[model samples]
Target chain A: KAENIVEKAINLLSKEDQAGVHFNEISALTRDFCRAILSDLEQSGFTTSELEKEIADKVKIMFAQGYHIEVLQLILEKILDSFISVIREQYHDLQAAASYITTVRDHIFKGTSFLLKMALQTQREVIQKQNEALMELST
Target chain B: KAENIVEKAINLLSKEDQAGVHFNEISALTRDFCRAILSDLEQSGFTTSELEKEIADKVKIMFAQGYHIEVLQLILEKILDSFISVIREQYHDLQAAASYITTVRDHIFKGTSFLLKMALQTQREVIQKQNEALMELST
Candidate 1:
């Protein structure tokens, strides 16, 4: 009845709780993204040649725009900038913020790296499988 | 003759390269972990009953000792403490350190959440598969 039941309920939560909920939403989204991507890679009908070509084209464009490592660095800088702005709003001390920021950064770096590794592993499997098929054909 | 050629070559890189190499090592490790765990689940020889039992026993112990969310919080706090100490050693101002720290934390939190979500999705698939099998058997 008032302000859409879900939004109204969410508003009743503490800021920390709200943050937690938001985090969960993003987590679910990430899970869906990984599953969808992995499923596509696993589809038997999808030819390995098509996959290789697609990856090549997609990665070529990505690298052109400073994707992967370069993009990650830029994104990290932007995130840090925003956090610094907010921390200053409460504590005039950067030292207090430094430790918290560093810890968060470390976690994010390690976590993001995991995703990259996963993608690489999936693609590597496809390539390796194709190579084995060719090798058998040659023999 | 050359003091373990690999170690000697690795020592030649800049600090940033060394970091990158270390990151790659961890990334590869994580990839192997995911593949091995996923492979175990997919194995034809592995029974659903056994998986369910294993997961139940493993998760029970983990929850008892404050694993998952509780453990993650503790880990994050510990990481923050270490970063803060280093920041203090360099600069007397806390304010300067706040922003960088915040950005890092955000990435880490988001990244970690992704891994947790992936695990949940994988387990959900196993559970769902088992349920479907049971439903068919009943019919």
Candidate 2:
């Protein structure tokens, strides 16, 4: 079933494109088929026979060249959600960094007057505050 | 007045710093005496002759080095408020980007039945929902 789906997509792409017949405009010609395939499926709502169901908590989507059995929302959600999720992903880094620097700050400057500060600590940079900034902006 | 202030700051940093004797760790020896100079004056609530203040929207602080005689929060309304102000500044850009893509989408695929959308639309990134994914991660 996957093989048939794959072949159908491949042929659809190749139908109006070729490796020969025009070489002078390679740059223009290269896009002939790749973009065509994307267009063919962009609004076609194409999908495969049986697709894996992923109930992702966070949205993140990507175009895997051969995946054609799901609605565009499947991929769109993934892409849109990825952006929202990155702040969280990076938030973990922030927490880790703050916690790390917190421990290190205690060890390094527990008694000494520390002078320098990194990007994480200065104003709206922390995860909680950055998210707050985002919310305040949205509203 | 500025000369005296600048000179006094330079001396403060130089008082503890030695240009020689600690040969092995020399690369780190050179710090812009000016930055440290300004820094000495920074948290000290230093400012210039005439201080104008405002931070209606955000908690912002800025330090203009070489300011001769002013206290903290004197002219720093622009400084600190600028950080908080960025939320709105970026908010405009967010709106701009979405509106721009909106027009472009209308122009490019006006007649086509568009099915999918991407992240730069439907919203900016946030944390509460995002970081929750992190909390589920024990620890």
Candidate 3:
């Protein structure tokens, strides 16, 4: 049942051209978050596997919708803000963790925005160029 | 003392360029790892400030000389492998995660290798072109 929903969502993403979600981007994002969390677990002297299992379960839940681009972006933003809030509240000096989260947030946001803009721009440019070529041929 | 160590390591990373560790590359790499780790954490239900503290501590400890690229790469590889291994062990039939990891790894490795080769080739070609131009001028 859930699998079918996931399949549908994935198909939607696949067929989507305007605000498409690329699997590669999603996978890279997942891998990176995994690394950070895993490092955190290891440092806490907790077995990383325990955390992995826990996180995998959450992934199972979230993967149900296959998470559209907007949804994914919103979740990431929320997480970033929450993460920073905790740091600021606890440490009283947001120098270290703030820097790290800020950097990551900027990169991810930039890449996502650029990808969307590029897709639209490329589509527009192709059409414009084709029209120009046709005009030259006609002349 | 630990803060001082981290500062020195940051300085070293900033000053050293022999191993192709540019600011942009390092920032991207760190962001990638962080993204993966965050995803994993969310999946596992380990969403708390405690996790962030653990991660910050781990990073502080791990940030030492002679362990920048290689160590970070090793940790990422391990996390990725473990991620695949767990999924494979749990679902036997769901090979998608494993395949996805392999695809991502290959893509990153191939892209980096290609870029490095292109840079070297371009450098050589430019030098050769300059030499030929000089010869023509002398003639």
Candidate 4:
């Protein structure tokens, strides 16, 4: 039913979402991606133009590079790269609930990587299956 | 084709997601729920062995009140409350991409509400209809 590559790709994520618990995992990764971007920009600590029109061009910057999936690959790398940093940063809480906080941090970190990795893997498989099926249907 | 209540609810969100590049909104809300729990725990700044295990029991705290529907209603409320807070906290990014972020937020806000409301509404109706149909078949 998907008429194009985009529709089919969207369907892949959408379909995974329908599977119930797995969607929650995927949903978390999606949000983290956006959140990381916001945080990265915030980390830059720029102000208004007064940073001017330049300060406001972040979204345009996003729109410019667009869906370079490699960009997403970079984000995936960044997320893993920052895992220890998040845990290390939460020192006090880490001390109070060493078992608890570490478990959660570990879980979320590993879980998120699995989530992102699996989601990407699933999409690749979906495209292959969808393409094969669509081709068969067309033929 | 959706054989149950879950599928019907998923369909509602999936339909909204197909809109050009807007699903990121719902994605953020989804992540926020998970993130909030972390931030809340982090913010609590609670303590060690002397403090007792009350701190580690939050999820159990949730399951103690577990249910079929009201639970979901609570999550919906949370999504909105946090959305407002996120913008307030990230004024820089919020300002930088005003139209883009605002539009995505509004569309996602409106869209998620519709997804939740209609998913709830539709599930209720599906139950009634399915019940009636099954009863008729039995008769």
Candidate 5:
């Protein structure tokens, strides 16, 4: 199960000190494990789209208040990196994979901008509400 | 000239700090300015392919001791980011841009793997050279 895999991976990582494992090696291994889990999930009749939506929902809830555009950019970039790695290793269809890569990249870029705008707009609304409250107090 | 534009951009950035400008706003403005300059150059018959090669050469010289993979990845990521931003603002062809984004993402992933391998190989060579030197000194 992914939960078990995640727990084991976290344990392996937590035991290491700063000078312990090579980061690249650890990153590669962790990604490989994740790919295995995802593949198994797919074979078990779960659509990739459904998994993506669930993950995205969790991410949004966890990061809702504090997330910024830069955070989104970093996450998207890392996800794209991992996606490309697994696809290259598992799927030999370079052309199809390449096409999908383009789609992911564009969506990430636009998504970051869209989310940033939402954050800023929300902040503005809060400030306006505060000013209104101050006016009520004065009255 | 590119040099002049870069200087002007830097000057603008210098004043930005005193003006209490947000980093995000500065980044966006600088990107916009860079695009305008590049567009002018393109209209003046400078092909993007040629400019890319020239930029790559300059980057190589600047980061001579750095890993080539790191340098290339940085350049490629920057180019993709700029390309996506421009396309979003000017073209509004989100569907087409999405495809391109996926391609960029996959390439970055593959590039990272190749870089990691190169770095590991470099470390091995360095160790081997040191061992050979020690043996020569003993003889």
Candidate 6:
């Protein structure tokens, strides 16, 4: 039910010691989440409520644990794959198909890029805060 | 003696078909570049001109070929390793050493983060441009 897995992680950071906080893999995690979600949507046409919750819950563990990007190209492949399947399933016009796929490819690429940047910035702020605290302690 | 490996790659992309333009490895490449440069800086105190050129020339091939973060932590490890060595070689005071290491760590972290973001953004712009052209062609 909770959609803001990232927000949840950020809040958890405050209470915990931040020992396992990893700035890496944020891009990969975001990309993987997008792929799984989009892949299911291509098949189920956005009716998979259970899948979203399932993934968020799953990813939250790996994310907090520091487990996890050619990110754009990889996502592009996923987008095209999903688009081809989706075109076969629903849209069949060639011109319209080209237009639709390009539009979708651009949309997902931009959205994913934004998410990746957000993830990076979120980690950057934490690192800055921690470093500032350490500096104060050393001084 | 050309030092702008990234710039060289960017310019080369314009002349080339950009069939091999890869956005995925930019972050990894940037991180590796930073690690290698800093490692040398730590060892030689910035006197290793040969190393920078050598690594850049080597990386240029892989980058153009689409090959290449835990970035901050990895860089942090390298930084600490170098700092310990440098402290042993020169500065021996604990108080001063702690202060120095923290300062250097923050600086390198900030710089590396900027470079990572720049690399990502550079690729983003290219993707956007290509998408726009494709959209125009389809229309």
Q: Model 3, which residues run further than 4 Å from truth?
A: A1-139, B1-25, B28-94
Candidate 6 Cα outliers beyond 4 Å, as residue runs: A1-62, A69-80, B1-139
Model 1 chain A, TM-score vs. native = 0.38
Supply candidate 1's per-residue lDDT for A12. Answer: 27
Model 1 regions more than 4 Å off: A1-139, B1-77
lDDT, candidate 3, residue B98?
51
lDDT of 3 by residue, B18-85 (tens): 34445554544444444544443445433334323433443343332222323333333333444444
Looking at model 2, give its docking quality level.
incorrect
lDDT of 5 by residue, A33-104 (tens): 345335534464433443334334433532343332233233334544555555566657878877655554
TM-score of chain B for predicted candidate 4:
0.33
DockQ of each candidate, alpha-carbon based: 0.03, 0.04, 0.02, 0.03, 0.03, 0.02
The worst-scoring run of ten residues by lDDT in candidate 5 chain A lies at: A66-75
Error of 5 at A66 (Å): 5.3
The candidate scoring highest on TM-score is 5
Compared with the true structure, model 3 gives a TM-score of: 0.23
Q: What is the interface RMSD, in angstroms, for predicted model 6? A: 15.3
Output candidate 4 Cα RMSD: 19.6
lDDT of every model, 2 decimals: 0.37, 0.27, 0.40, 0.35, 0.43, 0.43
Q: Write the per-residue lDDT of candidate 1 for residues B8-124, one digit (tens) a residue.
A: 222322222222224444233323322333334345653233323333443344434433322222232333334444555565666676654544344334433444434334434
Please write out the lDDT profile of model 3 over residues A3-117, one tens digit for every residue. Answer: 3323333444444342344575544444444344435433633333433443444334334434322334333333344444444555555567656555544443333333223
Better of 2 and 6 by TM-score: 6
Kindly give the stretch of ten consecutive residues in candidate 5 chain B with the minimal lDDT sum: B66-75
Candidate 2 residue B2 C-alpha distance from true site, Å: 79
TM-score of 4: 0.22
Q: What C-alpha RMSD separates each model from the true structure?
A: 21.8, 26.1, 20.3, 19.6, 17.4, 22.3
